[PDB]
């Protein structure tokens, strides 16, 4: 099969690939949520909800593993790090708890409804979802083992952040030697603008492809 | 000792932590050299390599340990893998001298003029200089293993390029719970201006800290 893609189309078999569901949580895309409480711009995911929607619906359809990622830890933080991580000190969750003792124990904390994935996006049966502690899902979890446990060498990224999660993720596969894809529009940055023009410009130029997601399902469709 | 920062000051031992010097071979600062040859802007590395000569001596005057990186493989490219490694599509030197194959052999490869450091930069005794195949120092390396075997816990990273060698340690450093500062007037991106801007403004909010050589050289001198 052949993805129309910048710098440059590639070849996949979408029985042996995976499309990975970035952190479509409420912290992360939701009005209310951690990222919005934390400062950051929410006001536009709702068009990256439905792209995912369509293609996951795709992808699932095509014999594609669907990998559904929940960031975030027990509501105590003990998986957070303590005052020994550098995580306890840049997570802006936790930054934003410490400001605001009423929301402590609520951002990204398993089991509320920060965590939750949103409503409009119900994993199915066969589905993989994985928990992470940190921002790339390589670390800390048992993601590679399960790539490549099936065989899977293509990775197809969508969610939140394109500069943070979904980019240390895809960054992480290409030094694990798998082949990463990033379908821009069902992704958004936490940042200003030129934060996604430059996660995208890093991912093309330097450690994967960029693609969209009415390619993707053209490319799905035989 | 502590060391002034965005987005916050920290706290750290310099004889508890590294000072990183990332890929400051001609390949990267130097006309002529591979990102010359691949079309990036590399006429104004010049201040750059002064910057990273005072820090250098600032650090090791600290007992901080300073570790070289350089970036590359056997003149063959075996370590850059085949094309059943996205590095082999992706490595825009690869690219490059598929493009023009006079310099087969000639960038990035391992007892060439490319991938020597350049010659103001030169490595003393007690230094450690590291090869690494890939853009992230952590993988596929003893890095780790050396950072651990000293108790160091802090890392400062300068070179080329700010978005992703540099950036690319920083991030799995953090992974790794390292604390990583860049010293941002003693590194240089690679590709247009959002590039650079986009990787301090991930490293200061997400992964780590931003100060200068200034300020860092000032925070040791005691």
């Given at each position: ?38 400062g ?48 306890f ?14 929301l ?20 199915q ?49 290409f ?27 890093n991912?093309?130029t ?17």
């Amino acid at each position: 099969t052949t993805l129309t893609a910048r710098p440059e189309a590639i070849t996949f078999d979408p029985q042996q690939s995976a499309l990975i569901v970035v952190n479509m949580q409420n912290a992360y895309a939701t009005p209310g949520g951690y990222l919005d409480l934390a400062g950051f711009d929410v006001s536009t995911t709702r068009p990256v909800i439905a792209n995912i929607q369509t293609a996951v619906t795709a992808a699932r359809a095509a014999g594609m593993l669907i990998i559904w990622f929940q960031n975030g830890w027990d509501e105590q933080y003990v998986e957070a790090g303590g005052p020994g991580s550098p995580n306890f000190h840049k997570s802006n969750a936790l930054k934003t708890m410490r400001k605001q003792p009423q929301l402590q124990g609520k951002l990204l904390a398993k089991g509320s409804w920060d965590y939750q994935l949103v409503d409009e996006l119900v994993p199915q049966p066969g589905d993989i979802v994985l928990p992470k502690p940190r921002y790339s899902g390589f670390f800390n979890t048992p993601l590679d083992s399960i790539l490549r446990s099936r065989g899977i060498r293509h990775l197809v990224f969508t969610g939140i952040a394109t500069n943070v999660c979904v980019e240390s993720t895809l960054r992480d596969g290409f030094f694990l030697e798998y082949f990463g894809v990033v379908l821009e529009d069902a992704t958004h940055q936490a940042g200003p603008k030129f934060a996604q023009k430059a996660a995208l410009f890093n991912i093309e130029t330097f450690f994967g492809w960029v693609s969209d997601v009415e390619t993707f399902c053209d490319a799905l469709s035989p």
